[PDB]
Amino acid sequence: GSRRYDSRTTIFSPEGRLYQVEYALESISHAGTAIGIMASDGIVLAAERKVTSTLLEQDTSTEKLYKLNDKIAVAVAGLTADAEILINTARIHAQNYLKTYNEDIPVEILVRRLSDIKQGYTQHGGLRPFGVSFIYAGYDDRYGYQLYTSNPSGNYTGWKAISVGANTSAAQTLLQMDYKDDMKVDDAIELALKTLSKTTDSSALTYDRLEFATIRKGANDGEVYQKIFKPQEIKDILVKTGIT
């Protein structure tokens, strides 16, 4: 019968590893680097677009940074198509929570449920896992500013500063070197860009090959604002830090 052609996506290796999860992580390691840095007064999301073409429409484009609700955003590393499936699910889960409790969903609860879906694809169903790693940047009134990452295994962890995709080894060393706890958003913005600028496989880091977003309390009195940076705004912040 059909047994002959079954890859068996949800099995263990002799060493006790999940083949398809390991190979999905190998896939993600070739994806454009995405960095999350959490400051005391906000969060930075920086992501490198995959080898841009000059005729790509840059301003009306979304590849890396997606909005889940007013308080939570994600940086993507891996298959974009896979990410959009999970993002639409996460967006619906957030609205289900708000409809039920009349309160915005706590960041970890959204992360856990999205990570629980990924886990499912590794244990049952006989389907390939989602070739996606997320950096979750969000705020709630319990833990304040939070950075999480999830990967195809469905395992998630919290971070002060983290990188996913390509050159995470090199990127994590540079973040570990220059990061400190009393750091401001404006300083975190500079760290995020400087890290990409050194770890990039490109000749020079330019505005057209970046996606940038901040989650500050920079709005008027005790409320959170999400800023998805425009091309011209990235061009200005890149000059202001002295990279171009």
Next chain:
Amino acid sequence: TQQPIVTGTSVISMKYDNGVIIAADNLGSYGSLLRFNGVERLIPVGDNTVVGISGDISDMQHIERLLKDLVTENAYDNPLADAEEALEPSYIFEYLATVMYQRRSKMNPLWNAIIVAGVQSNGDQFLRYVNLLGVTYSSPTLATGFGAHMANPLLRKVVDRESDIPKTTVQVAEEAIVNAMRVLYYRDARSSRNFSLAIIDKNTGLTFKKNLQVENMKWDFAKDIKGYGTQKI
């Protein structure tokens, strides 16, 4: 839940010494309208059984198709289909009785009263009744509808119990059935003069009589009956 539309009236039957007789008129009533006059309500199954059906005619035609299919199915992979493994009246009855009770239990009955008349392989007379409720009973005489009220009393004067069956000939038994059909024509408002009669004898086999008529009727005394009490003219 149903309501019967096109209906057949009384089916009457009785045992005699060597077999069974069954009869039913050829009418399909549409309420008070005597709409269809060429309706056969006696359906032979093989050469040893006759199923007489009263009630809803659409449901009767359904049962015809089931019995017709039963004969076909019994023949399949059956070298003795026309001998030892031929359909018995008891087999045909129990099948219908199972269906009738299953349909009443699903609150969607076959709106019928059925009498299975035949002769078993061992020569024993078979006569058993089943209706839309799945109720079954056997008696030397069986009748449905008005037949139960008017025919049974007349047929029971011939065969009042089991011991009277060997004493009853086919001539006497047929005479009683034909007389009962005349009485039903007098008194049942949804009966016709034209009827079919079937004899299943253990010796002479199945004799199916069509296009019989009620005859030797008494109407002459009607001319003497004037008014409803006092009127002399």
Next chain:
Amino acid sequence: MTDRYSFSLTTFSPSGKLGQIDYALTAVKQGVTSLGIKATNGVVIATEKKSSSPLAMSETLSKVSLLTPDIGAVYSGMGPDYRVLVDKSRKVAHTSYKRIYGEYPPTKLLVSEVAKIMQEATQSGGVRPFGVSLLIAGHDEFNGFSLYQVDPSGSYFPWKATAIGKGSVAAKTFLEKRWNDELELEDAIHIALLTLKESVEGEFNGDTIELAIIGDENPDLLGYTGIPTDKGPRFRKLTSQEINDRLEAL
């Protein structure tokens, strides 16, 4: 009996490649060249009509398809896969948008719905990916004119101008030189015909070229009058005659 293939036929290789998507892209590479150019006041999508036989009527086979009155689509790769995607794309525009909001979806969201269908063929049980890359040109009130590419993976990118299929590498280089942000629709049609002549080998006329635009509203193509707000479809397929007129002043 029954579909026993409830498992993925597309899986990650040790190197991290999704073989069936890569092989689907190889099938798109073999496919005939199609391109899309975005102007200030419109969008043009064009492709060569590779005829299977000269006895075949190439008019009956439409490589450029209307999805909504204001959205059009062209492809490179496997024609049958494209045809069923157009059917599903037209239906999803109604079921998941028009029957809810009483208006046609904006280009980006219809593209998103098509991308979703192609992603599912990458992960769902007992199916192979679609062996096509789509170019979807469209207009909507709040986003204006837009041009999107959709790959077998389900990934989509917005383009100023691009080409897919046989001679896409050369065609993209040609478009980089000619494209500017001040191009009028007629200038974009001219560049589209120049770009396509490089990849086409045999006959180059209105009968061997299929070209449609997303431009101004066409009240004459609406089919009725009386509703001022309904001004007609922005999608228009250029006729065999209309192409030949522009090939003289080439």
Next chain:
Amino acid sequence: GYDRALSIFSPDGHIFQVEYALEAVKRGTCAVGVKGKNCVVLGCERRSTLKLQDTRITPSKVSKIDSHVVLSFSGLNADSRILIEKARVEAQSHRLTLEDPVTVEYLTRYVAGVQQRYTQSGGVRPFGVSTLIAGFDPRDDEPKLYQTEPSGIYSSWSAQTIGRNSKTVREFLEKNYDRKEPPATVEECVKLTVRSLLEVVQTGAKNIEITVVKPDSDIVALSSEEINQYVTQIEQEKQE
């Protein structure tokens, strides 16, 4: 639905998928359970290759199933969440129907039953997780410590360890733990748990997590400084 029998017997009478699930547990960070006279202590290793972590929000290794029962684990972190969720639901379902919180044995038997079901169900692989389940039965002061494993077998332990280098810390506990006289106090029980982890861990900084469970739903997690005091005390006594 995906039906494939993934967990099947081999010629030598082994279920390789269940045995490969144990390899995933052996890869996992070390987890230790030690029960004293009037308490149970769950010690857990945290690998120190992860700096720039946020320890406020990072999922804790020890999970409360109810107010009186806790579950630690070794192996796949994602798999552990599914068992914990099911266990927490069963804990509330038991209170609802029996009008009494679960016994530690019952909660273990349920979790072990789930793990077993995934070893002979079509389309699923076994859980790459072994659990230590500890707590106190309602209105009872006798300490309970149970272990489960992917196969679905479970059993009660005076003291037990699971995960990487667990054979080293099991060796330590086997000679250092007296059945006739278990750790009489909380301090003695925590110290023996920390000592056992210090055979394997590396540094006694932010690598060791300790959770103490006491009778009548009295559970508390120790902070860095509180644990560091045990590490400082043990090292000074060692130099002898």
Next chain:
Amino acid sequence: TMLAFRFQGGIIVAVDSRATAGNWVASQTVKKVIEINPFLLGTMAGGAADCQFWETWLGSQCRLHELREKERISVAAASKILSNLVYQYKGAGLSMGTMICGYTRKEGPTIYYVDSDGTRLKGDIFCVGSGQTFAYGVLDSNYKWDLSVEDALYLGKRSILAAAHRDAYSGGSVNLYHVTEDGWIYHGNHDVGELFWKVKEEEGSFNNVIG
């Protein structure tokens, strides 16, 4: 009519033995106490089949509990299995009144009233059935916590007799039970035919009746 009350010396359980089909007295010898286990009793009022079927079913579920948990089921858990069962059938037309009476170490002597519309109540005194009010009248006016086992057994018996007399749909005989820490004890079948006259003579009560 069936009652069950808690007191100093454990639980008294008393029931009549009559079964009616309208005004037709169908039986005078029906067992309305189900012996679930040596420490659990169930009383039966309402639909004869509903009570009889689902309380023997309850006994099966209580047996499965002690096999799985190696421990006798609590009165609370036993009552709640039955209450959760009838609640699933709510609106279907089940007619059941029951008192689950028993002893366990953790609970002590316990009585749970469970009916077919899903009501589950813990309590010290309950009277259930067509003649519950007649039983309440006698029981409540003579009840004290400090009753002796001998006086408690009599009051339970006398309360059923009172209802057996006045209520047309109660009578036959009185079935007595006493539940202690050591389990339930049967205290006999008492025919109202002899018991009424014996009580009338000895007590001097029932002066409404022609002696």
Next chain:
Amino acid sequence: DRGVSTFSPEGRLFQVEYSLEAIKLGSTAIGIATKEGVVLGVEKRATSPLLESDSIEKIVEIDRHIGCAMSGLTADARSMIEHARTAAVTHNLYYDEDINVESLTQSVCDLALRFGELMSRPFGVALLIAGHDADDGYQLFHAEPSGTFYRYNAKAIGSGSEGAQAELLNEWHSSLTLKEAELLVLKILKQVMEEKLDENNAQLSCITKQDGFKIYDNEKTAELIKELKEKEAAE
């Protein structure tokens, strides 16, 4: 790979034959049937000295009149016991009587072959089902994952089975007392067990018509172990 319900060229189900290899790796379980009762004994085999041996439950009650010992992948036995207990109680509910030991065994053995592509694989555990009923009296059954069950006068299953079975062949007679059977299980367990037999690493049980199914205390078994050693030294 290959189908789960596949036949070998010799005419055996691969998965059933492979499950039997798993049962040979299991701890020893011995059952002896007499006219005074049926005795069930098991090797506990604790993997480590820290493991509390009393928590090792390899002898199990199904009903008051039916007991059960297991050997192999003991986790697989839980759903088999659950089914047996339900079957036993359900039959009592439907027929107001105790269920025949054979009928109970047959009900358990019906699960065995309900695997394929139902559960994904056969059971990796063998059961010794001991009981009493009014009709066939004291009985001992060996329920395999093949769906087959034999009645036995005496039977050993697990790692030391072939050695223990040869010993039971010589020792068993139709006139064995319950006390003689108890000692005989302990004697044969001590022979085939790796570690030295005591009350902590071995468990006895019996089923009698009068007292029903009873697991023996560690105090009671300890005295039978001491009684056994004295009798062997006495000649």
Next chain:
Amino acid sequence: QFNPYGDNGGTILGIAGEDFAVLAGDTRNITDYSINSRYEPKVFDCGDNIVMSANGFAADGDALVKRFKNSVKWYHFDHNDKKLSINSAARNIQHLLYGKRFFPYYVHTIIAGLDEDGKGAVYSFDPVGSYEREQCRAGGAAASLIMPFLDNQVNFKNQYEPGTNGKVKKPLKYLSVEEVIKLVRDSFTSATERHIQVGDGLEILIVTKDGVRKEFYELKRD
């Protein structure tokens, strides 16, 4: 609207002796004011020395008896030809009846035979499965006529010892098969006189350790 139930009349009577039990029933089958059959048996030998009658709606009665007979057959197959005890049969029939609690069998069921001590047993069921073992039970159309007579003559109710000032009750004792058949025949002749649905014929099934014997007696046919 279609009514799935009907009344086929008739009445049945079960009496238990010391070492025997009888289950009697009239052979008349009726609908409204019409006689369907003068001889339609409704007391059946079901095997294992159990006799059964399901009186009321004949269709439901035949279905139940048919299902119980089938239950006995499968009891043999599944439990090594073990004999189904009367107490075990009774509990089995409760589950048959209660299985249709929300669309009942409109029948009063009686079974008779010997218990496991060899003593005469009669069990009686309501339409939805409530059952009780009794020395005595009448069921069906004329149950209200016959039952109080059985209370008086079988269980000696309201009968005291002469000259004891109504203080000493008439002592209970088992009846001989001869005395029981007298009470059955007198019960059915009395019921025939005063109930229109009772008459035609009386069929008695007597159950001893030796097996199941039958006796038939004529009743008035009016």
Next chain:
Amino acid sequence: XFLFX
């Protein structure tokens, strides 16, 4: 039917 203290 049915019987119903």
Next chain:
Amino acid sequence: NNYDGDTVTFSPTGRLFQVEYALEAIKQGSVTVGLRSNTHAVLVALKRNADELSSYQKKIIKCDEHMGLSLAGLAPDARVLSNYLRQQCNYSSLVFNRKLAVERAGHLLCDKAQKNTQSYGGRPYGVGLLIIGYDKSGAHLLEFQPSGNVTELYGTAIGARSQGAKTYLERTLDTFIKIDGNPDELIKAGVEAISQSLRDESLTVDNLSIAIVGKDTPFTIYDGEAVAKYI
């Protein structure tokens, strides 16, 4: 070789190896003999034991008052097929008040075994059955093979060394067929037939299993001291 992975695969020579491997399970099974006259049909079965401490595996199963079979191979598969026959015999009785013909019993088993040989996931039955019965057309003996092939015979035998008993019955055909109105003599012929399949072992009291059905004889099984007459 490459074509024996499952029942859905044909070999290049048009063979179903999984069906042939199922047939092999019968050859390993203990011998059982079937034979009939015009009045009676007899099953004789050599029961097999695990060892001296074990019981003897019961080979004969009753299906109705007038029908039953003996098994050789996987006993659980015989239980499934016998249970199916019991239901079909029972369906015929309840619905048609009709005893199921032994020929239809064979046809129903054939069709049930066949479905397992044409579908993916399932497996063939690993047991052979000898069905005896007495119906409206007299005494019958059927041989069921899990390939689906059912055959009506005067006599036969299946299991290990069944060729010995099958040769004997082929010689004795003319004798035993005319043993009418004599049960004990027809059994003797069956016991002498199965004796031709014995090696080193002989027929003992708890080893031999006999069943008979006929004109005025319900299907009844004889075991233990009830077969001591025929040794």
